[PDB]
Design a protein around this ligand. Structure first.
Ligand SMILES: NCCCn1c(Br)nc2c(N)ncnc21
Ligand SMILES: NCCCn1c(Br)nc2c(N)ncnc21
Ligand SMILES: NCCCn1c(Br)nc2c(N)ncnc21
Ligand SMILES: NCCCn1c(Br)nc2c(N)ncnc21
Lengths: 262, 262, 262, 262
């Protein structure tokens, strides 16, 4: 089939990439970075993220693979020594696929609307002034948030920024999204829930400005200053990312190796 | 149908109970506290919990209802002023039901095995000495936990003890369980994940002793000192609790009213 | 003596200010906003902060007073109804003074050095890239910090930003400074202390860049992007802020009124 | 002078102890475990604690020393390889001393009063029922605490249990005590400060029962069920523990070695 390979650009990753291509030349495998069916990422989770966003418009016809030339990653979870064996069963096809939920982000302005897809998380901070927003869940005013910002994470994103904010780690088979607070201000006057919140499919969490209508919004690795913002809208996406499964590497084992010890 | 009513035992709750029975006498409704089909709890969430455990062996033939004669509760979420209107549509049947996941707890000894069902959570602390256990997830050693204890919470339990330990609040439609740490000790020598963990159905979290084989285990409101413990076993239950639905009272609205302001 | 009065600029605060001046005209009291001996702040703690920084070069010849025309504040802790009684004993002098510690901040560049004085706290975040610094305490490498940023707080500052980051509240009679982490990243690879740290007088906490030499540094309300930064240097200041004491209002009572209930 | 040596009782520690005594026999040094002037602890911090409490009635005539036959400890901070060099300068006297603050704990009953001295911390939990106490600071009602319990820590104790509860680490030269919450319950109905609190000398923090008058009180390693308790009283002690100083081992270096890496 068609396939392509991105690289972290360092010497190690470039050389591994040329090795796999040459190995791929020994099989029925076209190199196409336009309509590929297999996308191999070599480097770290960041390299994987870029691969994800480069092809987010053909998600349902692609199976991703991550190779970590550095430390183990949650997406780049295959060591370089397994490349040549990776090449072989990728080519002989007939592999199993696994899919993770994704986070849909909608921005409405006073123009139009902008939608984004996030594999890790989307965050909202203010443009310099104080960050204050009203939090509406399924059209009910839940809280007025005053603080540094908010973070909505996918299941697999919970080991990234979400983890640093006290969020829970959840198994990526759970179709859900998790919202955490960044340095919330709490007194008798101003009240937030404190706890992280976890939402199922079809629940819509909407942020609405109170004073400042300008917010710095991040979506995975992108960070853009949006102006004249009327609403920010979060929900579990209908789209999934598909991984090529060649081995048992449990998410919890992946969590242990990254945080307890390898 | 058959029905019964438990009360918090205070003057307010007893009198409301006699009122609903007398109201029930105006309908085709037998009072049976042996094989009832409707269980009404009047008081607080604790009163509801006791009602839950009193009839946990007939869960799939019962629809529960909570009335709070005190503050709003997450299970006793109907105000006393709605009792007489509650009586009427309960009697004319034809109401919708809603179900929450439950937590199965298994204890193995060096005799036999003891299983328990929890609506809020189950906790494990030590008998006085230091609490130390190895944590195995789906048969993989995940961490050696050293600290005060651990807490595994159901979805709806996440607003109770789980919340006090930094756990996330999750919507009770998510079939999952959440594990949190109690005062974990972390240094170069001893390492825990810190983050709360959220598990889907069919994942088995097993606690295994390292030195002391005696643990104080709680299951909702029960707390019993188990001796000669070989293993503690947590997983999402196959059994669900069924609620009688008479009105829209969203869980998140219930969360707002309890923690942000009513 | 000489005195001056700043105002939050809102209608309420301006009118209270003219009232106190007219009241002051009934006494031996010159209005001088150049070499005053009494500085009265009317509005909130922010109004007080500005008053503090406007005159930070004559700290040892000034006694400050805060009046809150809005909610109670930790610096503006006198209600508007006590203005006219405030005017009288301020004028008849012979009052007691109280002093709080201050935080000295030094910035070294590759030009020269810039020093700043902070009444609440100073924070360090990165210019957009990832924030990474080595933390040196009294010339010993303590940790490599990777995360959103760091915050060093004075005693009285601990109820502000410090509180939002999990820092402890400490009595302002303790000559100390407290450092807290902002969303620290912790794994097997990267290790921070997590806990907040509290330092006595004469301990020097130094931040040193690893890659990016550009940091957004805040000092109370100022926030400036410093470039080509070689070192950031924190320590308890030799200078103190002096308050005019007219009544017993314990810091802990002030803490209760602001966070538990008034 | 007179001296004595306690041991962790393991083979390693017993043999090191006999070595130092034999080494001590080569000097003007009497072994007296009744009125000693030098107390050497060999094992861990727990061994040191026991040594501390064994002689807490002669604190002002004793200089302590800790040797760790296991991992580095905050009190047992001398490696076994330095024993013979320890023996020599201890004997030739003329060494510097360093002192850490201690925590006084008073318990009043409906008989009399019981006082205790703590080197690490004192904790208060309930006898099985729910733990609820009113918190009075310098005779002002500060909060009604509902939760698992409270912990008051000395400066040097802040690296122990205090650290596990989110408390700050503070330099032991600061004469202060720190109070932290154990799983506090917070809602609209029940309100705690959340933040850890740090108190200077002469501030009196008093716990008073609301319903249950029975509390499990810990003081370092002791844990005793006190009944008919009218009040628990915390404050910085007038007594200090004195250490023999033979080398520069900064507390912060000690913190780094224990938590970041050795
Ligand atoms: N270099 C720090 C970021 C690495 N990273 C990315 Br990018 N995504 C994740 C993710 N999901 N879990 C954990 N770590 C992640
Ligand atoms: N009186 C304190 C316990 C009340 N309580 C019970 Br009992 N269960 C819950 C629950 N699920 N969420 C919140 N609160 C709960
Ligand atoms: N409007 C939010 C900031 C108010 N504020 C200032 Br400004 N300083 C403090 C301070 N020290 N403690 C508490 N609050 C403070
Ligand atoms: N085996 C766990 C207890 C060890 N330990 C003791 Br005992 N005291 C302290 C202390 N002050 N800081 C750190 N650790 C301490």
């Amino acid at each position: 089939m068609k396939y392509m390979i991105t690289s972290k650009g360092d010497e190690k990753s470039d050389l591994l990439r040329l090795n796999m291509i040459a190995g791929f030349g020994e099989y029925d495998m076209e190199y196409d970075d336009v309509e590929p069916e297999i996308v191999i990422s070599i480097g770290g989770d960041g390299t994987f993220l870029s691969a994800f966003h480069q092809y987010e418009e053909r998600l349902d016809e692609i199976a991703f693979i991550g190779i970590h030339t550095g430390h183990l990653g949650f997406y780049a979870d295959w060591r370089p020594a397994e490349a040549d064996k990776l090449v072989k069963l990728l080519a002989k096809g007939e592999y199993q696929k696994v899919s993770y939920p994704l986070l849909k982000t909608t921005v409405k302005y006073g123009k139009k609307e902008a939608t984004y897809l996030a594999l890790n998380e989307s965050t909202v901070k203010s443009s310099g002034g104080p960050f204050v927003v009203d939090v509406v869940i399924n059209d009910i005013h839940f809280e007025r948030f005053r603080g540094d910002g908010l973070c909505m994470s996918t299941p697999s994103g919970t080991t990234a920024y979400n983890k640093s904010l006290g969020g829970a780690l959840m198994h990526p088979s759970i179709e859900a999204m998790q919202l955490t607070e960044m340095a919330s201000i709490n007194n008798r006057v101003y009240r937030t829930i404190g706890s992280p919140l976890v939402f199922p499919k079809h629940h819509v969490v909407s942020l609405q400005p109170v004073n400042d209508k300008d917010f710095q919004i991040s979506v995975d690795h992108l960070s853009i200053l949006h102006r004249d913002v009327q609403e920010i809208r979060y929900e579990v996406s209908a789209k999934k990312i598909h991984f090529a499964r060649f081995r048992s590497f449990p998410f919890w084992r992946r969590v242990h190796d990254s945080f307890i010890e390898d």
